[PDB]
Q: What sequence folds into this?
DNA sequence: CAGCCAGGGACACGGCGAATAGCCATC
RNA sequence: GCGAGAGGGACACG
DNA sequence: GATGGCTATTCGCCGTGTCCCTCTCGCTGGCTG
C-alpha cells in the first residue's frame, strides 16, 4: 500500500486475483514527475545509466532485479539493434528474393 | 592640437578630437612593473614611496621577513631573525634564458640573526634563499623556458560586511555580518527569524551572542549599560539563560572542542588566541583600515594592531543592532560618527586587486611558514651553542613553493602572445577566479554583471564570451592601482564652477562620496559649463541632471571607461555592446601578416598601445644612427657611448606566430630618446597595425557571401595582402634506455635511401629543406629489444662476438597536414655540458615554417564584430569594379549589418573611402557650418591620409556627410563615390552594371588565428585507448569525432538502427570486429555482423569488481 | 523554470487553491492570511482554507 | 580513383549541439578544392549553422544497411519539414527571401 | 549463462554477491602490495600484476619463458605456474583479497536510507558506532 | 506504519529473492583486472597514478598488518583499531569520500574509487557507452556552397 | 534605469549611456549560457522519460 | 647526498527525503 | 598516450 | 512523568548541455656508503 505500480500490471493482477477469492487490490491514479518516472523503469540498466547511479544500482542489486534488454537505451549500450525503426523484427527479418518471372528472365 | 604630439617619430595621424586630454595615458604596463618592484624593493619604488608616504617604506619581502621574525623556542632560550633582503644580478640574460629552457631568476640572499638567551650571542650570515624568478622588462616571467604572465586577481578585501536578507516565510528583514579576515577564522553576528542575535565562531551551529559578551568579561549590568536603547537586546538579556563568564567560556569550549575537557585557563587562552593573537588571526593592513573606516574608531592613529580588539567587536554588535532598528548615522565612543549602511560585496570599494607582487608575497609567506615550522622543530633536536643558522635554515620548501606557484598554478598563465595587443592585454587583465576566489561553478549570475563602480576601473566591453563572462576583465586605460589594492581613477576637480586641471586619483569610495560629471561636457574654454544641467553620476550609481553648481568632479576624458583593446575600435559609440565586445575579443587574435599596413581609420591608442607593448624597439637615449642592418641597429649617443640594438628576426612566439623586427631608420637619421627605432610583428612605423585595409562592398553577391561568409579577390592571394608566416616547433630526445642508450644517426633500419637524401650526416635534417607529411626530421633509432637469433645464426654470432645490432627505427616525423621550410636546428647534448632532464643524452629542436596564404574557410573579421569565414575567393576578373576599373577586394553581406546594431563598419567604410581619396573642404566662403567645429588642417587631406577618431569623441555623422560631399577626384574628372557614400558598380560576370548604387569603401579587416589548415581533420584508423578500446581523441593524435548522447538520440529518432549499431559497435569498440571490417572492405566482401562492444565488457568487469554479481542469462 | 517544474510535477511555488465542490461561497477576506469557504451542494463540508 | 569510389556513397554531416533530429543529415559527397566542407545554404536552418566559424563532423557509413539508411531515412532532400510542427526548414531565408 | 558474451543476450541480472562468488571469480589471490619490479619492470609475483593471478603480459610466454610459441597453448608451466595464452586474458581474469576480518559494504550501510539499518532496524548513527568500533552489541542473549 | 512500510520494502525484497543478505558483509574483496587499471609510465621514470592500484595497496597493507597483529598476539584495543582501519581502507576503495574525509592523494587530490568510474557525467555509462568516439570520421570548417 | 538612453546608435551614444547599455548586454550573455545548460538538462530528462 | 627502497578547513542554488525538536494529549 | 589546470572557438533577441 | 503523535527545522544528497582546438605540469621521505 502506497507503492506505485504500472496500471496495466495493476489491472492484470486484479483480474488474476479476482478468482480464487474476490479481493482485488484498490488503486488510485497518480501524477508523477519525469525524473521519478524514468528512474523507476523496469530495466535497471537504463536507470543506472540515467541518473542516481548508486541508489538505483544498489537497490536493483538488493532486489536481484533482472533486465530484459528490450528498451531503446538498454539495447544501445550492449550494441544491438534498437527496437525501433529498421531494428524491429517486422523488418529485421524481412526476406527478399527475385520474382519468378524476372528470375527466369535472367 | 591634433595628433598625439608627445612621441618623437609620430606619423602625422590627424585626429577628429574635440576635447583636449588633460592627462596623457599612463604606463600601461605599470600595474605589473610597480607591483614586482614593490616586492623587490627596487629604488624606483623606494623614492616614489618616499614621495607618497615616506613614513612607512617597506618592500614585500621586507614585510614578510619582519612579520615572520623572530623565530623562538617555546622555552624562550633563543630566537632567530631575518633581514637585509638582497638580490644579485640575473644569472643569464632574457633571450639566453628563453632559449636554453632556463628560468630567468636571480639568487636571493637574506641575512640571519640567531640570538641566544641562556648565554648570550647573536649569529649572522648571508643565506642563499633560492633562485627567485625575476620579472622581465615588460611584465612576463621567463619560467622553464616558456613565457608566463601572472594575471592580477580580484578578491573581496578582508573586513566587515553587513547584509540584509528578506525572510520570505515571515516578510521580516534579517541583518547579518561576516567579519572575514586574511588567514583567520570566520565569525557571524546575525539575527534569526525571531528577535534574537546569533554568534558563530568558525561557523559553529549559531549561538546567542551573550555567551560571548560575558566570555569577553562583560557583566549583565554593563551589557545593559552598553545597549540601553534596543528592545531586542534587553529581550535577549532576558533570554540569555547563562550566568557566569566561565560558564559561557566552558560552554563555548565544549561547542568548539567536543570531547575536550573544558577548563578556565584553557578557555581564557583559546578564546583570546582565536581573535587577538596575531599568529593565527591577522586581517592585513587593508583589513584594519577597512574596519576602522566602517566603524570610524581610529582616524589619526597609524596602522598598528592589525588584530581585533573587544572594542571593535562590540562596535560591530552595536552597529548591527542599530542598523536592524533602522538608524541612518551612528556615533561610537572614542570614534568619529559614521553612516549606518549595508555593504555590497561587489562594489569596487570592497573588492580589491591582488596584483603580481602580493600574490608572490603570499606564496613566499606560505613557503617561509613551512620553513619556520621546520626550523623551530629542528631547533629542539640540535644541541645549543653547536649549530649555525646556515645549518638551521632548510630552503627546499621555499623554492618548492615558488616553483609550484610559477609553474602549474591558476594565475601563472601561459603568455598569450601572437600579436603585441594580445600580449599587452593579457597583462592588465583582472581574473576574478583562482585560489582565494570564486570558481566558474561557484560563480553566480550577479558577480558577473557590470556594477556602476566599474566606470574607469574595469572595462565593461572587453571580456571573454565563453564561460568566463564578467569574471575576467581588463583595467581601463587611465586606471591605477592604489597601494592597498583598490583601483583608483583620475579626476579633474572642479572648484567654484571652474574645471581646473588638478588631477586627483579617487577610489570607488571617494568617487561615490562626491558627485562626478560626464567627460564630454562643454566647458567655455575656461572651466565653466555652457548649460546648467549636466549629466552627473550620483552616489549609488544613479545618472541624473544637475545644475553646474553641485558638480564636484569630472572625468579626465572620454574613453576613461574602455580598456586598451576596446579603445582601438573606431566609432565605438555607434556599435552595440555585444558586437563591441566581440570586436575587442577578436582584436587579440589577429596573426601578424608579412606587411602589416597601418589602418587608414584608427585611434590615438594605436601608437601608445604599440610602444608600450614592448616589442617595438625603442631608443632609451637620443643619438645619431651609426649603422643599420637587418640584424642590428647601432646608434651613437651624444657622449661617447654606442649601443647596438640586436634585432629579433624570425623568432617563434608562444602561439606559433612570427616575431620579426625590421629597422625603420637609416645611417644618417638622428633619433630622440623614446623614439621607435624599429617595428615589431604588427606595427607599421610605430603604430599598431593588426590587419589590412581592403576595398569593401556591402551588397549580397550571388549568395557566396551568405550569412557572414566573406568573398575575397584573388589579388589578396596574388599580392600577398593577407598571408602570415607560421613557425611550428618539433622536439625529440634520445635517452638512456633500459637496454642501453638511444642514438640519432643517419644509419637506420630498413627504409628506402631517398629519404636519407635530405638528412645530414648526423641525423637532423639540413637547413632550408622543404618537408611534408611523413618526412624524416631526426633520424633516430632505439634498441629494438631482446631478440632471438636463428640457432645457426646465434652460434655463428657467438663465434664472431658480434653485437646484435638490432635497433628499431623511431624518428621524429611531422604530423599529418604539415609542411614547409626548416628554419633552425637547435641541438643540446651532455657532451656540450648543458642542462638536460635526467636520463636524456640528446635533445634537438627543429623549427618548420610555412607561409600560410589565405584560403577558403579562413576566418576574417573587422574591428566591430563582423566575423566570417571565406566562402569563395573569386578571380580578379569576375569581381565588381568601379568605373575606374578597380575591383572590390571583399564583399560583405548587407543583411548582417542592420540586425546586429554595429553600424560603425558602415561609418568606418565611409571614412576609409574619404581618407583614401582625400578631401578638400571648399573654404571659399568662410567654412561650411558642419565644418565649424572641425579642427584645422582637416579641411584638406591628401590621398592615403591616415586619420583617427577617438573612442567616444570622434567624427560625427554630419562631418562624415560633409567629408563625403567633397571627395576630390582620383585622377580624372570623376567622383566614384557620391555624397551618399555609395557607388555605381559594374558586375564582373554579366558585364552590365548593378541597377542600384552599392556602398563601397575601405575597411580595416584582419586575419584571425582560426585558419582552416589547423582545423581540418580526417580519421579512418589510428591509435586506440588501452583502458577502453574506443578510438583516441583529438587532432594531435589521429582521433575520431565523438558521437555523443545527443547524436545517438538523433539517430534513434530517425529510426536508423543499423547505422547506430555501426557507429557504436564495429567502428569504435568491437576489437575483434574492426580488423574484420578492414579486411572485408579491402577485399570487397560483405560487412561482417557486429559483435559486443569492449566498453560494455569493461562495465561488466567493474560492476563485478564492486561485489555486484552481474551475470548474463542466455535464456 | 515553469516548464521544468511543470514536467517535474513539482508543487508550484505559487499554488492557487481550486475548489472541490460547487455552490455558494462564504467569503472571509483575511488580512495577512485568507479564508474561503464554499457551501457544499452535497452538503459535505465547506472545505476551509487558510 | 578516389572520385571513382566516392560517387554514390553518402556521408553523414553533424553539428554539435545536435538539438533535434535534423542536426545529423546524410549528404552525397563530392571532391572540392580547399579545406572547407561546402554546405548547401538551405540546410543551414536545419543545422542552426551560420558560416562565422562553425565546424562540422563527417561520418562515413560502411555496411549496405548503413548506406541505405543514409540514402533513404536521412538524405537531406528527404528532410524538408521539421519533425516538431511540420513547418518547412529547407525554405529560402535571408538573402533568398530578400531576392 | 554466456561466458564469451556473444550478442545472443536475453537478460542482465545484478544481485548481492557473496564471498563464495568472489572466490569463485578470481583466478588467484593477491596477498602482497607489489605491482612491478623496480629494475626489470616485470609484474611482481603474488602481487597486483602477477601473471599467475591475471595472465601473461606477453602472448604465449610464461614468467620463466619456458614456452614462447603458439604450439604451447592452454597448458600451465610446471615451474613458474603461469598459464601460457594470449595477453588479452589480463583484461578479464580477476583476483580476490582474503580479508583477515569481515568488512561491511558502504553502499548498503551509509547510502541513505541505510538498507543495512532497515534490515536490522538500526538507526544510521548507532550502526556507524557499531561498525566503527565505538561500542559493543548484543547478538544473542541466552 | 510508514517506517514499517519502508522496512517492509527492504525485508520483503530479501524474502522474495533466493539470495541471503549476508553479501553485505565481505569476507573477500574482488580485484579488477590490471589492464582496466593500467600503470602508464611518464617520461622520467615516474609512473602516472592509476588511482586504483594505490587504494588496493592500502587495503593489502592493512590486511597484512591485521594478519600479523593477530599472529603476534596484540591487545583488544590495537587489533580493533586495526580492524577499523581496514574497514576504512576497503571503504575508500569501494566508494571514496562517502563517509568521513575522502582518502586524499598527491597534491590534495582525492582519489577515484570504483564508484566514481560509474557515477557522474564522466562515468562509463554517460561518457563511454551512450556516446563513444568513432572511426572513419573527420571534421572541418563549413562554408556556403550555393552552387550545390 | 529611468534616465533613459536617448541617442540612437547612428547619432552615437555618449559615455554614460553606453555604460548603461553594457548592463543589459552582459546580463543577456550570461543568462544565455545558463539557460542553455538548463534546457540541455531538461531535454535529457524528457528523452529519458 | 641518490639507488633502492617505501609512506590545518572558504561566496552556489534548488528541490527531495529522513531525522530529529518542540509542543499538545492522554494514562 | 591518463589526470589536473589555463586559454579559446561554435551555439534562437519576438 | 513518558509514549503518541503533529508540525517545523536541520541537514545530508542529488543534479546543474554538446562538440572541438591549443598550451603546460604531474607527491614526499629514510638507510646507507
Ligand atoms: Mg555560428
Ligand atoms: Zn614458466
A:
Amino acid at each position: 500500500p502506497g507503492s506505485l505500480i504500472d496500471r496495466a500490471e495493476f489491472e492484470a493482477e486484479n483480474r488474476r486475483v479476482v478468482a480464487e477469492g474476490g479481493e482485488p487490490a484498490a488503486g488510485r491514479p497518480v501524477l508523477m514527475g519525469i525524473t521519478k518516472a524514468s528512474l523507476a523503469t523496469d530495466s535497471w540498466l537504463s536507470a543506472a545509466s540515467f541518473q542516481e547511479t548508486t541508489r538505483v544500482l544498489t537497490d536493483a542489486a538488493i532486489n536481484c532485479r533482472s533486465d530484459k534488454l528490450n528498451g531503446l537505451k538498454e539495447n544501445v549500450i550492449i550494441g544491438k539493434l534498437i527496437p525501433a525503426g529498421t531494428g524491429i523484427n517486422r523488418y529485421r527479418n524481412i526476406a527478399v528474393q527475385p520474382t519468378e518471372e524476372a528470375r527466369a528472365a535472367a | 592640437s591634433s595628433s598625439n604630439n608627445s612621441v618623437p617619430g609620430a606619423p602625422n595621424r590627424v585626429s577628429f578630437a574635440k576635447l583636449r586630454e588633460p592627462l596623457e595615458v599612463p604606463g600601461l604596463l605599470d600595474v605589473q612593473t610597480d607591483s614586482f618592484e614593490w616586492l623587490i624593493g627596487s629604488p624606483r619604488w623606494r623614492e616614489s614611496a618616499a614621495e607618497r608616504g615616506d613614513v612607512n617604506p617597506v618592500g614585500g619581502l621586507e614585510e614578510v621577513l619582519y612579520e615572520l621574525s623572530p623565530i623562538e623556542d617555546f622555552s624562550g632560550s633563543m630566537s632567530l631573525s631575518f633581514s637585509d633582503p638582497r638580490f644579485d644580478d640575473v644569472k643569464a640574460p632574457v633571450d639566453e634564458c628563453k632559449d636554453k629552457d632556463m628560468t630567468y631568476a636571480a639568487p636571493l640572499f637574506v641575512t640571519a640573526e640567531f640570538i641566544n638567551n641562556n648565554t648570550g650571542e647573536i649569529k649572522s650570515q648571508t643565506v642563499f634563499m633560492g633562485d627567485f624568478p625575476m620579472m622581465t622588462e615588460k611584465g612576463t616571467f621567463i619560467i622553464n623556458g616558456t613565457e608566463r604572465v601572472v594575471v592580477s586577481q580580484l578578491v573581496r578585501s578582508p573586513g566587515v560586511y553587513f547584509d540584509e536578507t528578506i525572510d520570505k516565510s515571515t516578510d521580516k528583514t534579517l541583518h547579518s555580518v561576516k567579519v572575514i579576515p586574511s588567514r583567520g577564522a570566520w565569525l557571524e553576528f546575525d539575527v534569526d527569524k525571531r528577535d534574537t542575535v546569533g554568534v558563530r565562531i568558525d561557523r559553529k551551529r549559531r549561538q546567542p551572542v551573550t555567551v560571548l559578551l560575558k566570555a569577553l568579561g562583560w557583566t549583565s549590568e554593563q551589557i545593559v549599560e552598553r545597549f540601553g536603547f534596543s528592545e531586542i537586546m534587553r529581550s535577549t538579556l532576558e533570554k540569555d539563560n547563562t550566568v557566569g563568564t566561565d560558564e559561557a567560556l566552558l560552554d563555548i569550549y565544549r561547542k568548539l572542542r567536543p570531547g575536550e575537557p573544558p577548563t578556565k585557563e584553557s578557555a581564557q587562552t583559546l578564546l583570546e588566541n582565536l581573535f587577538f593573537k596575531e599568529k593565527r588571526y591577522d586581517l592585513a593592513r587593508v583589513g584594519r583600515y577597512k574596519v576602522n573606516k566602517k566603524l570610524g574608531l581610529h582616524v589619526g592613529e597609524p596602522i598598528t594592531s592589525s588584530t581585533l580588539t573587544e572594542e571593535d567587536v562590540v562596535a560591530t554588535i552595536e552597529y548591527l543592532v542599530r542598523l536592524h532598528e533602522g538608524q541612518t548615522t551612528m556615533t561610537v565612543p572614542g570614534g568619529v560618527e559614521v553612516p549606518v549602511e549595508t555593504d555590497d560585496i561587489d562594489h569596487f570599494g570592497n573588492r580589491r586587486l591582488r596584483t603580481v607582487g602580493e600574490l608572490i608575497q603570499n606564496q613566499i609567506r606560505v613557503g617561509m611558514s613551512r620553513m619556520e615550522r621546520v626550523v623551530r622543530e629542528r631547533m629542539t633536536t640540535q644541541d645549543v651553542e653547536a649549530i649555525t643558522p646556515q645549518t638551521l635554515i632548510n630552503i627546499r620548501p621555499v623554492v618548492a613553493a615558488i616553483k609550484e606557484f610559477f609553474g602549474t598554478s591558476q594565475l601563472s598563465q601561459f603568455m598569450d602572445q601572437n600579436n603585441p595587443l594580445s600580449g599587452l592585454t593579457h597583462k592588465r587583465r583582472l581574473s576574478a577566479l583562482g585560489p582565494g576566489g570564486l570558481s566558474r561553478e561557484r560563480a553566480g549570475l550577479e558577480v558577473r554583471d557590470v556594477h556602476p563602480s566599474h566606470y574607469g576601473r574595469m572595462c565593461p566591453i572587453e571580456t571573454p564570451e565563453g564561460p568566463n563572462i564578467g569574471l575576467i576583465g581588463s583595467l581601463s586605460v587611465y586606471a591605477r592601482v592604489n597601494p592597498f589594492g583598490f583601483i583608483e581613477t583620475p579626476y579633474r576637480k572642479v572648484v567654484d564652477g571652474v574645471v581646473s586641471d588638478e588631477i586627483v586619483y579617487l577610489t570607488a569610495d571617494e568617487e561615490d562620496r562626491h558627485v562626478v560629471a560626464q567627460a564630454n561636457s562643454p566647458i567655455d574654454a575656461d572651466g565653466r559649463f555652457v548649460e546648467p544641467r549636466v549629466l552627473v553620476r550620483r552616489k549609488a550609481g544613479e545618472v541624473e541632471y544637475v545644475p553646474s553648481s553641485e558638480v564636484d568632479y569630472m572625468d579626465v576624458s572620454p574613453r576613461q571607461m574602455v580598456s586598451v583593446a576596446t579603445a582601438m575600435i573606431p566609432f565605438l559609440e555607434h556599435d552595440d555592446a555585444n558586437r563591441a565586445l566581440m570586436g575587442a575579443n577578436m582584436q587579440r587574435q589577429a596573426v601578424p601578416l608579412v606587411r602589416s599596413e597601418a589602418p587608414l581609420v584608427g585611434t590615438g591608442m594605436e601608437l601608445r598601445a604599440a610602444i608600450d607593448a614592448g616589442d617595438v624597439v625603442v631608443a632609451e637615449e637620443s643619438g645619431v644612427i651609426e649603422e643599420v642592418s637587418a640584424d642590428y641597429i647601432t646608434v651613437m649617443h651624444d657622449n661617447g657611448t654606442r649601443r647596438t640594438y640586436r634585432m629579433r628576426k624570425f623568432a617563434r612566439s608562444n602561439h606559433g606566430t612570427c616575431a620579426n623586427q625590421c629597422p625603420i631608420v637609416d645611417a644618417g637619421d638622428r633619433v630622440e630618446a623614446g623614439q621607435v627605432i624599429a617595428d615589431g610583428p604588427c606595427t607599421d612605423d610605430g603604430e599598431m597595425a593588426l590587419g589590412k585595409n581592403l576595398l569593401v562592398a556591402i551588397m549580397p553577391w550571388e549568395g557566396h557571401n551568405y550569412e557572414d561568409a566573406i568573398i575575397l579577390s584573388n589579388r589578396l592571394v596574388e599580392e600577398d595582402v593577407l598571408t602570415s608566416i607560421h613557425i611550428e616547433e618539433h622536439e625529440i630526445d634520445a635517452r638512456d634506455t633500459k637496454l642501453g642508450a638511444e642514438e640519432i644517426t643517419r644509419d637506420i633500419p630498413n627504409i628506402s635511401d631517398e629519404v636519407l637524401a635530405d638528412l645530414d650526416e648526423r641525423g637532423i635534417v639540413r637547413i632550408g629543406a622543404e618537408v611534408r607529411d611523413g618526412d624524416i626530421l631526426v633520424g633516430k633509432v632505439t634498441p629494438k629489444g631482446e631478440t632471438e637469433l636463428t640457432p645457426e645464426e646465434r652460434l655463428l654470432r657467438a663465434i664472431f662476438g658480434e653485437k646484435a645490432r638490432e635497433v628499431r627505427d623511431t624518428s621524429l616525423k611531422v604530423p599529418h597536414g604539415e609542411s614547409g621550410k626548416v628554419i633552425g636546428i637547435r641541438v643540446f647534448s651532455r657532451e656540450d655540458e648543458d642542462e638536460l632532464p635526467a636520463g636524456v643524452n640528446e635533445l634537438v629542436r627543429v623549427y618548420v615554417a610555412q607561409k600560410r596564404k589565405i584560403s577558403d574557410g579562413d576566418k576574417l573579421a573587422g574591428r566591430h564584430g563582423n566575423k566570417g569565414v571565406i566562402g569563395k575567393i573569386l578571380p580578379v576578373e569576375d569581381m565588381p569594379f568601379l568605373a575606374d576599373g578597380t575591383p572590390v577586394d571583399i564583399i560583405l553581406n548587407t543583411h548582417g549589418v542592420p540586425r546586429r546594431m554595429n553600424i560603425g563598419q558602415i561609418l568606418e567604410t565611409h571614412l576609409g573611402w574619404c581618407a583614401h581619396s582625400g578631401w578638400k573642404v571648399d573654404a571659399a566662403k568662410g567654412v561650411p557650418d558642419w565644418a565649424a567645429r572641425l579642427p584645422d588642417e582637416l579641411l584638406e587631406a591628401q590621398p592615403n591620409a591616415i586619420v583617427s577618431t577617438p573612442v567616444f569623441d570622434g567624427a560625427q555623422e554630419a562631418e562624415l556627410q560633409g567629408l563625403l560631399s567633397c571627395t576630390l577626384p582620383n585622377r580624372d574628372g570623376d567622383v566614384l563615390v557620391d555624397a551618399d557614400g555609395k557607388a555605381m558598380l559594374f558586375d564582373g560576370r554579366s558585364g552590365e552594371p548593378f541597377p542600384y548604387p552599392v556602398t563601397v569603401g575601405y575597411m580595416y579587416i584582419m586575419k584571425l588565428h582560426h585558419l582552416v589548415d589547423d582545423k581540418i581533420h580526417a580519421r579512418s584508423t589510428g591509435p586506440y585507448s588501452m583502458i577502453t578500446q574506443q578510438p583516441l581523441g583529438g587532432k594531435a593524435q589521429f582521433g575520431g569525432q565523438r558521437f555523443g548522447e545527443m547524436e545517438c538520440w538523433a539517430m534513434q529518432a530517425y529510426g536508423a538502427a543499423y547505422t547506430l549499431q555501426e557507429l557504436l559497435t564495429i567502428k569504435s569498440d568491437d576489437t575483434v570486429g574492426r580488423v574484420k571490417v578492414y579486411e572485408a572492405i579491402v577485399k570487397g566482401e560483405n560487412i561482417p555482423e557486429p559483435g559486443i562492444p569492449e566498453s560494455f565488457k569493461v562495465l561488466l568487469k567493474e560492476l563485478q569488481s564492486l561485489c555486484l554479481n552481474v551475470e548474463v542469462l542466455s535464456s | 523554470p515553469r516548464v521544468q517544474e511543470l514536467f517535474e510535477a513539482r508543487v508550484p511555488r505559487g499554488k492557487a487553491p481550486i475548489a472541490d465542490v460547487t455552490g455558494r461561497v462564504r467569503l472571509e477576506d483575511g488580512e495577512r492570511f485568507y479564508k474561503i469557504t464554499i457551501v457544499p451542494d452535497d452538503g459535505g463540508e465547506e472545505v476551509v482554507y487558510d | 580513383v578516389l572520385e571513382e569510389v566516392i560517387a554514390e556513397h553518402p556521408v553523414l554531416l553533424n553539428r554539435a549541439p545536435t538539438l533535434h533530429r535534423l542536426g545529423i543529415q546524410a549528404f552525397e559527397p563530392m571532391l572540392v578544392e580547399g579545406k572547407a566542407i561546402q554546405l548547401h545554404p538551405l540546410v543551414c536552418e536545419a543545422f542552426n549553422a551560420d558560416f562565422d566559424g562553425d565546424q562540422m563532423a563527417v561520418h562515413l557509413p560502411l555496411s549496405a544497411e548503413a548506406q541505405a539508411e543514409a540514402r533513404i531515412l536521412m538524405l537531406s532532400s528527404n528532410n524538408i519539414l521539421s519533425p516538431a510542427s511540420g513547418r518547412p526548414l529547407a525554405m529560402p531565408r535571408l538573402d533568398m527571401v530578400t531576392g | 549463462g554466456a561466458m564469451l558474451d556473444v550478442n545472443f543476450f536475453d537478460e542482465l541480472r545484478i544481485g548481492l554477491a557473496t564471498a563464495e562468488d568472489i572466490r569463485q571469480w578470481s583466478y588467484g589471490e593477491v596477498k602482497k602490495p607489489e605491482t612491478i619490479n623496480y629494475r626489470t619492470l616485470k609484474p611482481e609475483k603474488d602481487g597486483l600484476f602477477c601473471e599467475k593471478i591475471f595472465g601473461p603480459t606477453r602472448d604465449w610466454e610464461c614468467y620463466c619463458g619456458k614456452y614462447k610459441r603458439v604450439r604451447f597453448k592452454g597448458i600451465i608451466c610446471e615451474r613458474c605456474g603461469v598459464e601460457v595464452t594470449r595477453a588479452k586474458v589480463r583484461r578479464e581474469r580477476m583476483g580476490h583479497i582474503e580479508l583477515a576480518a569481515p568488512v561491511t559494504h558502504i553502499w548498503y550501510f551509509k547510502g541513505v536510507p541505510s538498507r543495512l539499518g532497515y534490515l536490522l532496524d538500526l538507526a544510521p548513527k548507532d550502526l556507524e558506532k557499531i561498525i566503527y568500533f565505538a561500542a559493543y552489541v548484543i547478538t544473542s542473549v541466552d | 506504519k510508514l517506517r514499517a512500510l519502508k522496512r517492509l520494502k527492504v525485508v520483503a525484497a530479501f524474502q522474495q529473492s533466493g539470495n541471503s543478505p549476508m553479501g553485505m558483509v565481505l569476507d573477500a574483496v574482488p580485484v579488477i583486472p590490471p589492464e582496466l587499471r593500467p600503470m602508464v609510465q611518464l617520461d622520467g621514470g615516474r609512473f602516472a597514478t592509476s588511482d586504483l592500484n594505490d587504494l588496493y595497496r592500502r587495503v593489502i597493507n592493512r590486511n597484512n598488518r591485521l594478519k600479523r597483529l593477530i599472529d603476534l598476539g596484540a591487545p583488544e584495543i590495537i587489533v580493533n583499531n586495526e580492524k577499523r582501519m581496514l574497514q576504512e581502507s576497503v571503504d575508500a576503495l569501494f566508494d571514496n569520500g562517502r563517509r568521513g574525509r575522502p582518502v586524499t592523494g598527491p597534491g590534495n587530490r582525492p582519489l577515484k574509487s570504483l564508484s566514481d568510474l560509474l557515477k557522474g557525467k564522466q562515468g562509463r555509462f554517460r561518457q563511454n557507452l551512450l556516446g563513444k568516439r568513432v572511426d572513419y570520421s573527420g571534421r572541418s570548417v563549413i562554408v556556403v556552397g550555393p552552387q550545390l | 534605469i529611468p534616465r533613459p538612453v536617448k541617442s540612437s546608435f547612428r547619432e552615437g551614444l555618449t559615455v554614460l549611456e553606453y555604460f548603461i547599455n553594457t548592463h543589459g548586454a552582459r546580463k543577456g550573455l550570461a543568462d544565455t549560457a545558463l539557460r542553455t545548460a538548463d534546457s540541455g538538462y531538461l531535454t535529457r530528462r524528457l528523452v529519458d522519460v
Summary: Chains E and D do not touch (no CB pair under 8 Å). The two ends of chain E are 45 Å apart (CA to CA). Strands of chain E lie at 11-16, 95-104.
